[PDB]
Coordinates of C-alpha atoms in Angstrom, one line a residue:
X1 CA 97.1 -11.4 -21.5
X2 CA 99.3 -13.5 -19.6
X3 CA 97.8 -15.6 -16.6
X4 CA 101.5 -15.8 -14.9
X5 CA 99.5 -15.5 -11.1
X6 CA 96.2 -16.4 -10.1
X7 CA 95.7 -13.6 -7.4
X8 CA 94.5 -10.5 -8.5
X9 CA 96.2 -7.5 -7.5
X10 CA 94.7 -4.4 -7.3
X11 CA 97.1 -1.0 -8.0
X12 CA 96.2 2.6 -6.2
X13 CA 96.7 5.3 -8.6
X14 CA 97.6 9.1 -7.7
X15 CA 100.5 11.9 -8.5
X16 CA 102.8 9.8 -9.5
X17 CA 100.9 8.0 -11.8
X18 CA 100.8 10.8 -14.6
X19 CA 100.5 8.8 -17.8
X20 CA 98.6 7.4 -20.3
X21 CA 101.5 5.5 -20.6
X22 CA 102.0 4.9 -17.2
X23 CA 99.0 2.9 -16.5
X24 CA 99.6 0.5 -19.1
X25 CA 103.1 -0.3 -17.4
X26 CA 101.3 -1.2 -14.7
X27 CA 98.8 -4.0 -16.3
X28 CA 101.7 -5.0 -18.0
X29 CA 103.0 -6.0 -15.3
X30 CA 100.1 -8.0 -13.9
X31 CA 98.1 -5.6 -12.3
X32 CA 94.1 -6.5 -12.6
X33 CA 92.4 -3.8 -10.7
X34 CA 92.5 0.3 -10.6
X35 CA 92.1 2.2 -7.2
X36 CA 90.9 6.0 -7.2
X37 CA 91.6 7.2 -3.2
X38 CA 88.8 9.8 -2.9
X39 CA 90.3 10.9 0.2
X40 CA 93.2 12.5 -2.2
X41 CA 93.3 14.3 -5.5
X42 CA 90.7 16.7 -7.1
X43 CA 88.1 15.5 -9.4
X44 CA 89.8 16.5 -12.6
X45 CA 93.0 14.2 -11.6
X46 CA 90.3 11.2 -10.7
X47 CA 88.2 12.0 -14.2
X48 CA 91.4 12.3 -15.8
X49 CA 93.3 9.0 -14.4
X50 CA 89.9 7.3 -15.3
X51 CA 90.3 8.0 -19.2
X52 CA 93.6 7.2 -19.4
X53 CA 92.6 4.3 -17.9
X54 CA 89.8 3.0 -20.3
X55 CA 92.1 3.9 -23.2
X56 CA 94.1 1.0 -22.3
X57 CA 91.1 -1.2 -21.4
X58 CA 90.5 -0.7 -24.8
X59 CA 93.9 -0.6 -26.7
X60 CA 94.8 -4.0 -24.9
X61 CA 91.0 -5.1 -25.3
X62 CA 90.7 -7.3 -22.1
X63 CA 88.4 -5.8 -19.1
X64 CA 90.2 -4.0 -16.4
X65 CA 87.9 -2.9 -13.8
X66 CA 88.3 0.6 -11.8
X67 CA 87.9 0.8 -8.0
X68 CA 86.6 3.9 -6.3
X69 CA 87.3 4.6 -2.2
X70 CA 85.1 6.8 -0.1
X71 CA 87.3 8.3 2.4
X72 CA 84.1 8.2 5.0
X73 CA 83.7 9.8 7.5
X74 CA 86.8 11.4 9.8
X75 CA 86.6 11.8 13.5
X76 CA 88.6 15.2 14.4
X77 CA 89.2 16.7 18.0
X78 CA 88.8 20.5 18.3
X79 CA 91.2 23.4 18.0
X80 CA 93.5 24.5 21.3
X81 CA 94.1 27.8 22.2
X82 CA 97.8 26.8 23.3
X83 CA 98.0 24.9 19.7
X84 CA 100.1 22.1 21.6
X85 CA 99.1 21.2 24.6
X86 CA 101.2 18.6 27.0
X87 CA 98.8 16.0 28.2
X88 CA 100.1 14.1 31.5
X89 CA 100.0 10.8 32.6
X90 CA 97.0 10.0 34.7
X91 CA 95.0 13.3 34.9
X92 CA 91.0 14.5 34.3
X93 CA 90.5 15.6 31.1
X94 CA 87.1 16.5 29.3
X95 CA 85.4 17.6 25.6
X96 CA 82.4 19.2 25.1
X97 CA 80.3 20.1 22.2
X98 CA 81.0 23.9 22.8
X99 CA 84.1 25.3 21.0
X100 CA 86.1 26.0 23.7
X101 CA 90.2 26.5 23.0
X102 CA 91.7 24.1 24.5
X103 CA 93.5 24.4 28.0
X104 CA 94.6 20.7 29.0
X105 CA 91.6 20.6 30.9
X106 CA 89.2 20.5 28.2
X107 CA 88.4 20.8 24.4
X108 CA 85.4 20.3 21.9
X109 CA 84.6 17.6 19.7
X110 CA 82.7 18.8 16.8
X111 CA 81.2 16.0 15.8
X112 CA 78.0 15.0 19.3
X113 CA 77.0 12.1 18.0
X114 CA 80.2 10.4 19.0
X115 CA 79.3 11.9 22.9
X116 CA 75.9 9.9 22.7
X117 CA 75.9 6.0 23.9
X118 CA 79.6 6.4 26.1
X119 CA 80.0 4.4 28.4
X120 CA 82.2 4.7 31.6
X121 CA 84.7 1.7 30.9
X122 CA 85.6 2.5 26.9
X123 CA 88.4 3.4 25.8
X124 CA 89.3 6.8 23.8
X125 CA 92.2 7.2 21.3
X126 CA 93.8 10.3 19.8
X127 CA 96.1 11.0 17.3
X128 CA 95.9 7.4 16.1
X129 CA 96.1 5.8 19.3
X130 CA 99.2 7.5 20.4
X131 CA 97.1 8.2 23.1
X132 CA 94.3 6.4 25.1
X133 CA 92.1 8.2 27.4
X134 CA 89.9 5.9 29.9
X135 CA 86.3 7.8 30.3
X136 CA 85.8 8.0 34.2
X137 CA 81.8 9.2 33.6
X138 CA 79.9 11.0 31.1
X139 CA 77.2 13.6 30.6
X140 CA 74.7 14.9 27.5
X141 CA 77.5 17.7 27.3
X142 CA 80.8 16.4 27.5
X143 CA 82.7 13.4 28.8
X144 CA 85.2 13.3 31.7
X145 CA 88.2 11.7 31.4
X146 CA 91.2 10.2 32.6
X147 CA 94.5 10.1 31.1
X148 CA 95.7 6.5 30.9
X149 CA 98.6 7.1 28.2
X150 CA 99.8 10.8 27.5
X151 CA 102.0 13.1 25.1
X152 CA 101.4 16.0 23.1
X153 CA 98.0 16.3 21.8
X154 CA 97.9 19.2 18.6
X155 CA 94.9 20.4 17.5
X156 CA 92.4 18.8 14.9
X157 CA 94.0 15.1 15.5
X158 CA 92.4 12.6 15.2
X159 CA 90.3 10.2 17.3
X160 CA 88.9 6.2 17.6
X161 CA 86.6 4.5 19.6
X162 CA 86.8 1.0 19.5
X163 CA 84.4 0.0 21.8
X164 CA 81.6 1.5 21.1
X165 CA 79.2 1.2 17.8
X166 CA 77.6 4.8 16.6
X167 CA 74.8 5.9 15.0
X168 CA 76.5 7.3 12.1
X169 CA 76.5 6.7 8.8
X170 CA 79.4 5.7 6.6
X171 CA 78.4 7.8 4.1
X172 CA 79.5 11.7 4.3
X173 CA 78.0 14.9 2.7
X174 CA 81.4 14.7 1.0
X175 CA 81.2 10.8 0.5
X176 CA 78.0 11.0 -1.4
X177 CA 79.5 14.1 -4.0
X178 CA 82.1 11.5 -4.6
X179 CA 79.8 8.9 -5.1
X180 CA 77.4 10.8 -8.2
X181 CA 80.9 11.4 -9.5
X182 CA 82.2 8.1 -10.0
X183 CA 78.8 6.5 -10.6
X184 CA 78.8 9.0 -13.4
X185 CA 82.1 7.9 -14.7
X186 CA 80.9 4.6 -14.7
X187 CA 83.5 2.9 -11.6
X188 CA 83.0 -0.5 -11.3
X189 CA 83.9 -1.3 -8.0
X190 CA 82.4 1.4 -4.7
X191 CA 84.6 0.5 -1.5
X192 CA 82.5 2.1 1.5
X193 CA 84.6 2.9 4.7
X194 CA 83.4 3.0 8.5
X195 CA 81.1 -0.2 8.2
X196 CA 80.2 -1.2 11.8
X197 CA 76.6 -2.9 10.5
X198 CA 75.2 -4.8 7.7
X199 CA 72.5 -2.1 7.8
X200 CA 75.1 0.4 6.4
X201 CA 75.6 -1.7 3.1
X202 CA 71.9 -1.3 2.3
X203 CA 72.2 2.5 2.2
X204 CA 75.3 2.7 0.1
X205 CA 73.6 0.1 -2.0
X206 CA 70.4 2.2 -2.4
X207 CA 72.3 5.1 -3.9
X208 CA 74.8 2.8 -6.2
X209 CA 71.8 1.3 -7.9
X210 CA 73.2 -1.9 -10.0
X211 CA 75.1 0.8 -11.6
X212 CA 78.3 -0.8 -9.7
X213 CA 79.1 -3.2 -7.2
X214 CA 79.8 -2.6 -3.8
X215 CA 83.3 -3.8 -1.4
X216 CA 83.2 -3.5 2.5
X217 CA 86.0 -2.5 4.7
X218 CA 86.4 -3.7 7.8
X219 CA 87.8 -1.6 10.1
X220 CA 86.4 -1.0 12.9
X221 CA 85.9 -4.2 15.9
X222 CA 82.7 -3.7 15.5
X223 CA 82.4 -4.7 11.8
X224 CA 84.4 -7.7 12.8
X225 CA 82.3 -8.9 15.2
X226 CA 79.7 -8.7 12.4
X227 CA 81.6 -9.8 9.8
X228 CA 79.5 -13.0 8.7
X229 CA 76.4 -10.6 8.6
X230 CA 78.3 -7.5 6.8
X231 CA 80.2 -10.2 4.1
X232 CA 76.2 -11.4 3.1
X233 CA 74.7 -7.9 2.2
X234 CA 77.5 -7.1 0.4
X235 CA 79.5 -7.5 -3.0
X236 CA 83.1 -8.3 -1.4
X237 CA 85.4 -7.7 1.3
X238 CA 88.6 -4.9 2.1
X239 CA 90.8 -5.6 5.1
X240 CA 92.2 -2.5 5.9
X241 CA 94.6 -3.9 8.6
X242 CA 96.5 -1.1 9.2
X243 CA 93.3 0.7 10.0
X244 CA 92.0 -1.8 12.6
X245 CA 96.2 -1.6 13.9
X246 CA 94.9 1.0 15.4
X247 CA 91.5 -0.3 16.9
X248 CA 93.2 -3.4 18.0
X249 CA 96.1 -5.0 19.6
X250 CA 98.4 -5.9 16.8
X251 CA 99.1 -9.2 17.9
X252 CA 95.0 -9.9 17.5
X253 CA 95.0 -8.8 13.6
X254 CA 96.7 -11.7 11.4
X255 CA 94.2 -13.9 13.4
X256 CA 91.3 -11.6 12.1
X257 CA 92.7 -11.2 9.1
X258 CA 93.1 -15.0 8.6
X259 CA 89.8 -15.5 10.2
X260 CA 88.0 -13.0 7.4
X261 CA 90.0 -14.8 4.0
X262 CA 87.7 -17.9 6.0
X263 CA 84.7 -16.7 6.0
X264 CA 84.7 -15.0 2.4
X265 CA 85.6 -18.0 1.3
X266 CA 82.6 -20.0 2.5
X267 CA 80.4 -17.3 1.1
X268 CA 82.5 -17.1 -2.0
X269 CA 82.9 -13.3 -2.2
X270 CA 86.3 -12.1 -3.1
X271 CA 88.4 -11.0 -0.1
X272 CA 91.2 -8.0 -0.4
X273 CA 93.7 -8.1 2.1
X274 CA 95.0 -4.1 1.8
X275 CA 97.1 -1.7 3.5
X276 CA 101.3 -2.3 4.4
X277 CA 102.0 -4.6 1.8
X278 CA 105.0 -3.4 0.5
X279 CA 105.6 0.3 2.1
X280 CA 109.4 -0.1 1.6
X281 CA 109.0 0.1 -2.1
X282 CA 107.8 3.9 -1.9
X283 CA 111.3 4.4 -1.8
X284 CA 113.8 1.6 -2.3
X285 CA 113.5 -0.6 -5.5
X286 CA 113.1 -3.8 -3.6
X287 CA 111.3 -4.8 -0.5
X288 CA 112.4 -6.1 3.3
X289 CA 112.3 -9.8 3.6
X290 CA 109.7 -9.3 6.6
X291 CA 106.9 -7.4 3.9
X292 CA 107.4 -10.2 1.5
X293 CA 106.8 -12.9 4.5
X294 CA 103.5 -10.6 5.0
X295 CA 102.2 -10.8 1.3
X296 CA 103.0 -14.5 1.2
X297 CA 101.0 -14.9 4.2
X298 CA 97.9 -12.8 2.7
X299 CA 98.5 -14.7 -0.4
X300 CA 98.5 -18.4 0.9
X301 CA 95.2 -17.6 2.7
X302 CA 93.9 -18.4 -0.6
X303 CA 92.4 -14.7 -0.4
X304 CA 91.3 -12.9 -4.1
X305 CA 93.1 -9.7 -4.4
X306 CA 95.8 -7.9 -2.9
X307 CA 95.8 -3.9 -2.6
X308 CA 99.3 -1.6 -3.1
X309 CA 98.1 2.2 -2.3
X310 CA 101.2 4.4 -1.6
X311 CA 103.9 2.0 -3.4
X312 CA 102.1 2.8 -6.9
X313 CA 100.2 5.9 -6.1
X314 CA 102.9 8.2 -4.7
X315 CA 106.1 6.5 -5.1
X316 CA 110.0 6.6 -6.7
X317 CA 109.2 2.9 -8.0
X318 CA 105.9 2.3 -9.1
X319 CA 105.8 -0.3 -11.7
X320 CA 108.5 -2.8 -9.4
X321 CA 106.3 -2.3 -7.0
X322 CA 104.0 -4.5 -8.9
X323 CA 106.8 -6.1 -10.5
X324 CA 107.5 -7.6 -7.1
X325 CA 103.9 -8.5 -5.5
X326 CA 103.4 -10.8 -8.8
X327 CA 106.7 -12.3 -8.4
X328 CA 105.7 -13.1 -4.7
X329 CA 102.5 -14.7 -6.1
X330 CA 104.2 -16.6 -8.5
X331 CA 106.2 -17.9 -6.0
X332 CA 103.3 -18.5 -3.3
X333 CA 102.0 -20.2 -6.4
X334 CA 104.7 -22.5 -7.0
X335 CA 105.4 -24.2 -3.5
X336 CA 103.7 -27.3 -4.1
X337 CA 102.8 -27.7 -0.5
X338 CA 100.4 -23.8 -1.2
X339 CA 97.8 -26.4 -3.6
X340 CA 97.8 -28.8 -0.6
X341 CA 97.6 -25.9 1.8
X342 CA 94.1 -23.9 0.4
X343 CA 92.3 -27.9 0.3
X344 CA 91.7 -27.6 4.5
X345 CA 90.1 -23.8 3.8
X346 CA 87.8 -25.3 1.1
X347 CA 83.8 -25.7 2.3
X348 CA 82.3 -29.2 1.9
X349 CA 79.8 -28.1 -1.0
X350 CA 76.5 -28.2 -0.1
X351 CA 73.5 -30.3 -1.6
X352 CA 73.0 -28.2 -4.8
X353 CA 73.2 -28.7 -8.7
X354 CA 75.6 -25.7 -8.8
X355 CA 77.9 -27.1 -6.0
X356 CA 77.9 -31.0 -7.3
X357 CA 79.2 -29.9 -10.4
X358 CA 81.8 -27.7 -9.7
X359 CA 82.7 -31.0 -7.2
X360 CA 82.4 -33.3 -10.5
X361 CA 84.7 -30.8 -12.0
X362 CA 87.3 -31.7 -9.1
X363 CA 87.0 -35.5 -10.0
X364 CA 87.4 -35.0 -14.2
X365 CA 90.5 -32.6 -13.2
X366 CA 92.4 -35.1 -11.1
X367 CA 91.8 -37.9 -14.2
X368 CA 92.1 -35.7 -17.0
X369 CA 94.6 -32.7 -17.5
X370 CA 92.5 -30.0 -17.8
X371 CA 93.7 -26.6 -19.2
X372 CA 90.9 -24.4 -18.5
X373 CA 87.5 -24.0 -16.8
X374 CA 85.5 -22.2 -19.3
X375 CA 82.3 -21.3 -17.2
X376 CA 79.6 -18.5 -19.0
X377 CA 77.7 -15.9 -17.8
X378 CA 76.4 -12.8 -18.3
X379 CA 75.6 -12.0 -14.1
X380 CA 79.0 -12.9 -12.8
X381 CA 77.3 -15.1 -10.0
X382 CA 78.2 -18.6 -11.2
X383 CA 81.9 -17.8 -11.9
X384 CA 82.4 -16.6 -8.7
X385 CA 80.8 -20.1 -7.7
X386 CA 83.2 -22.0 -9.7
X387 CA 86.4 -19.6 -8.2
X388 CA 85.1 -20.2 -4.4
X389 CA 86.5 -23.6 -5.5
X390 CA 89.9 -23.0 -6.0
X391 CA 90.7 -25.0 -9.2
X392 CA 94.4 -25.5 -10.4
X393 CA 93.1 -24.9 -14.0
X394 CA 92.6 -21.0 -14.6
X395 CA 89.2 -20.1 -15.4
X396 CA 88.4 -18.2 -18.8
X397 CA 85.0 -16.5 -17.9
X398 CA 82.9 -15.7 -21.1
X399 CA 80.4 -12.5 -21.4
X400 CA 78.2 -11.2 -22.7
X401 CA 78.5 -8.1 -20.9
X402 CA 81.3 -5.7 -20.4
X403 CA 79.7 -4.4 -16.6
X404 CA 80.3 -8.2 -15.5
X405 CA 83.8 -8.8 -16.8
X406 CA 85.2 -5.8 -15.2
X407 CA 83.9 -6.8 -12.3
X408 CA 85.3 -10.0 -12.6
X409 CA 88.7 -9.1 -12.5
X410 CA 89.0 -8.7 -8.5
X411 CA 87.6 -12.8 -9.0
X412 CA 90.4 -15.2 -8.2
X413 CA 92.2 -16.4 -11.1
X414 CA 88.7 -15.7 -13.2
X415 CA 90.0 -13.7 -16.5
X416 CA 87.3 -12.5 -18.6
X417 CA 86.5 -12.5 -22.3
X418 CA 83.9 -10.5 -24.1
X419 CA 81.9 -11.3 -27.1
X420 CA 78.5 -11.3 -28.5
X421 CA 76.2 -13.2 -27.1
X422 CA 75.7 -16.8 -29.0
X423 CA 73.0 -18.1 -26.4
X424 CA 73.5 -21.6 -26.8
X425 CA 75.7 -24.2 -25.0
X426 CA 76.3 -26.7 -27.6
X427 CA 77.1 -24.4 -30.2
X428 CA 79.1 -22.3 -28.3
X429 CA 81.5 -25.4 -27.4
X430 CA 83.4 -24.6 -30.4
X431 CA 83.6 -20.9 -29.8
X432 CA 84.4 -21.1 -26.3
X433 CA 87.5 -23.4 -27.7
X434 CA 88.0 -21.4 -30.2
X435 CA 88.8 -18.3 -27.6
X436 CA 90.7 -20.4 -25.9
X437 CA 93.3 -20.4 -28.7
X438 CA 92.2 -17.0 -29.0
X439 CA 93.3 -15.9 -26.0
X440 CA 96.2 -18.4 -26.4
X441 CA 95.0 -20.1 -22.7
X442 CA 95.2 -24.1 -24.6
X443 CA 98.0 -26.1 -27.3
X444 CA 96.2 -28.2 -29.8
X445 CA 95.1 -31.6 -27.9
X446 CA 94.2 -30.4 -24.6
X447 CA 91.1 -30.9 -22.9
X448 CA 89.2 -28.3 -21.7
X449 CA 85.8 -27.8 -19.7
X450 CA 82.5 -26.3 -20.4
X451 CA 80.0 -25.2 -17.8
X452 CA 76.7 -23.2 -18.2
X453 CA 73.2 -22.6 -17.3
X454 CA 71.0 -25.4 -18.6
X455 CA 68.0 -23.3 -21.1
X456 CA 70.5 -20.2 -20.9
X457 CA 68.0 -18.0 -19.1
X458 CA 67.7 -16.5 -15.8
X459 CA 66.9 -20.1 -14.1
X460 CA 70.2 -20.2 -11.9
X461 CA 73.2 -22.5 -11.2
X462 CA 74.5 -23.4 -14.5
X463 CA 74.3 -27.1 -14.1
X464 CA 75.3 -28.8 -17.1
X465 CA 79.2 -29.6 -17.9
X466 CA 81.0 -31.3 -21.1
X467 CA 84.7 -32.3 -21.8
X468 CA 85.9 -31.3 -24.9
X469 CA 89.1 -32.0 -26.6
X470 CA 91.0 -29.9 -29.3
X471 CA 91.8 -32.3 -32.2
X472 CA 94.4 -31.3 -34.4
X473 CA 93.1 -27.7 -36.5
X474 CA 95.3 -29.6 -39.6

C-alpha cells in the first residue's frame, strides 16, 4: 500500500461493479472504503459484492473496511385518479389520511404521522421541492393548503418538510431487515439516514451492538441545528448535501457544510462530505472544472473521507473516477499554502495527558524530520486522537484487532497494520520499526515516533512517546 493521499475516499459499489476483479481496481487506485446502497440491489448482489470484497482484503492483506447505507425512511404522496394532475399557481389544496384519488383538490398521504405537529406557516415540498406548498391551517384529518409554486404533480412523488421535526424513527421495517443482514455479514461501518435527534443514534446503536460502528447523515435542518449533539452520540459524520439541496437554499449549504468539517473536527470524529462530487464522470472520462473546484473545496476543509456513489456504482468509468478524486487530493495535498490552511481549523488542545502529547509531537516534528507517527491501539480511540491533529507525517496505526483497523480506514491519513499482539511498549519499538520497513513507510536513518498507552491496559490516553532512529540494518 501506497500512502500517495492522506484523505480517505470511500467508493459506492453496485451493477457496474461485477468483479472480483473489479474491486481490486478500485483499491488500487486509492480507494479506502466500500459502500453497499441498501436502497438499491437485492441481497444476493450486496452478500455477493461483500465476498469479493474480503477476498481482496485478504489477497492484498491490509484492512479495507465495508460501509452499509440504510435507505430510511421515504416520504410518498398518494395515488391520483387523473395520474397527472396540473397543480396551479396560488390555489387550496389538501391531503388526508383517507385514500382518496386525487382530483387537484385533494389527495392522501399514507404515512399520518407526518399530519401530526403542522403548523400553519411551514413549508411543504413535493417531488423534491419542485414544488412548495404553504399550509394555510390544519386539522387531525388533513391539511389545507395553498399553492405557493406549481407544476405537475404525478402520483407517489415524493415529499419534504423542512420545518418541522417528526416523531418518526430513522429506522424502517425495511431498514431493520437490512440491518440483521449486514450485521450478519459482518459490515464495518452502519450509515443511518433521516437523523433529526441525537436520540435517534441510541436506537440504531442498541440494535448494532459493538458489532459495528455507526456514521450519521445529516440531512435534514433539523439535524443541523443539532449537529454538536448528533456528532457526540455518534461514531462519525455523512454530509449528504445534495439531500439537504433540497431542504435548504443552496446558497446556505457550503456554509453548513464548512461549518460541520468544524465541528467534527473539534470532536475528532471523521467527517464524509458525500453526494455530487464528480457526477460528470458517470459518463465522460474526465470531470468539469467546476466539480473538481467542489472536491478541492471538501478536501481543504481538512474533512476525513470523501464519498463517489453513482460515478463507481453505476457508471461507463468507474475506476477514473477514482483515478481522478485521488489526483485532486494529491494536488489539494500539494499546495503548500493547504498545510498552512488546516492550522486556523485546529482546536487549542485541552489540559489532558492525551492532548499534550500529541502537542509535544507537533514540537519534535518541526525539529526533527519525522517519517511516521506510529500510535497503537487495539480500540481505535487514541489514533483518531492523534489524526484530529492533523500531522504532516502519515500515521501507521498498529492492532491488535482486525474490527478496529477496518474501521480505521475512514480515519484521516491513519493506515492500519495488523499483527499479534506483543503488549509491551519498549519491546515493541523495534517491531513497530520494523513494520515500518515492512510496510515500506521509512529509508534506513529516519526517525520515527512511538506513542502508546502507558501499562498497555484499558487505563486511557496513551501518554507516553519516544523517538527512535533507524541505524543502518548493515
Amino acid at each position: 500500500m501506497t500512502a500517495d493521499k492522506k484523505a480517505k475516499i470511500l467508493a459506492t459499489l453496485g451493477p457496474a461493479t461485477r468483479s472480483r476483479d473489479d474491486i481490486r481496481a478500485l483499491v488500487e487506485a486509492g480507494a479506502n472504503l466500500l459502500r453497499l446502497n441498501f436502497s438499491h440491489g437485492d441481497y444476493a448482489d450486496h452478500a455477493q459484492r461483500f465476498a469479493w470484497v474480503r477476498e481482496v482484503e485478504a489477497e492484498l492483506n491490509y484492512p479495507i473496511g465495508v460501509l452499509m447505507d440504510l435507505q430510511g425512511p421515504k416520504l410518498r404522496v398518494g395515488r391520483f385518479a387523473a395520474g397527472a394532475v396540473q397543480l396551479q399557481r396560488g390555489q387550496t389544496f389538501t391531503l388526508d389520511l383517507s385514500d382518496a384519488p386525487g382530483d387537484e383538490r385533494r389527495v392522501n398521504l399514507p404515512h399520518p404521522e407526518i399530519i401530526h405537529a403542522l403548523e400553519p406557516g411551514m413549508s411543504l415540498l413535493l417531488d423534491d421541492g419542485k414544488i412548495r406548498l404553504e399550509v394555510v391551517n390544519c386539522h387531525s384529518d388533513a391539511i389545507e393548503t395553498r399553492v405557493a409554486v406549481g407544476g405537475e404533480l404525478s402520483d407517489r412523488k415524493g415529499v419534504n418538510v423542512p420545518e418541522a421535526v417528526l416523531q418518526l424513527s430513522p429506522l424502517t421495517d425495511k431498514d431493520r431487515r437490512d440491518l440483521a443482514f449486514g450485521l450478519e455479514l459482518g459490515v464495518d461501518w452502519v450509515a443511518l439516514s433521516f437523523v433529526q435527534r441525537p436520540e435517534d443514534i441510541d436506537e440504531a446503536r442498541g440494535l448494532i451492538g459493538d458489532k459495528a460502528f455507526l456514521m450519521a447523515k445529516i440531512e435534514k435542518p433539523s439535524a443541523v441545528s443539532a449537529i454538536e449533539a448528533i456528532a457526540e452520540r455518534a461514531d462519525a459524520i455523512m454530509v449528504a448535501r445534495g439531500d439537504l439541496g433540497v431542504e435548504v437554499p443552496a446558497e446556505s449549504v457550503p456554509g453548513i457544510q464548512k461549518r460541520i468539517v468544524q465541528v467534527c473536527r473539534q470532536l475528532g470524529k471523521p467527517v464524509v462530505v458525500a453526494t455530487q462530487m464528480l457526477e460528470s464522470m458517470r459518463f465522460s472520462p474526465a470531470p468539469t472544472r467546476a466539480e473538481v473546484t467542489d472536491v478541492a473545496t471538501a478536501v481543504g476543509a481538512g474533512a476525513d473521507a470523501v464519498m463517489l456513489s453513482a460515478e463507481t456504482a453505476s457508471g461507463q468509468y468507474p475506476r477514473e473516477a477514482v483515478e481522478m478524486m485521488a489526483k485532486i487530493v494529491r494536488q489539494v495535498e500539494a499546495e503548500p499554502d493547504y498545510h498552512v490552511q488546516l492550522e486556523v481549523n485546529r482546536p487549542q488542545p485541552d489540559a489532558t495527558v492525551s492532548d499534550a502529547i500529541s502537542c509535544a509531537i507537533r514540537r519534535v516534528s518541526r525539529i526533527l524530520p519525522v517519517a511516521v507517527l506510529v500510535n497503537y491501539t487495539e480500540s481505535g480511540n487514541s489514533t483518531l486522537r492523534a489524526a484530529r491533529e492533523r500531522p504532516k507525517a502519515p500515521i501507521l496505526s498498529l492492532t491488535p484487532n482486525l474490527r478496529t483497523a477496518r474501521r480505521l480506514t475512514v480515519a484521516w491519513g491513519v493506515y492500519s497494520v495488523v499483527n499479534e499482539q506483543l503488549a509491551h511498549v519498549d519491546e515493541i519499538c523495534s517491531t513497530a520499526l520494523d513494520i515500518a520497513l515492512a510496510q515500506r513507510m521509512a529509508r534506513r536513518g529516519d526517525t520515527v515516533v512511538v506513542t502508546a498507552g502507558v501499562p498497555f491496559g484499558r487505563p486511557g490516553s496513551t501518554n507516553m512517546l519516544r523517538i527512535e532512529t533507524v541505524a543502518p540494518p548493515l
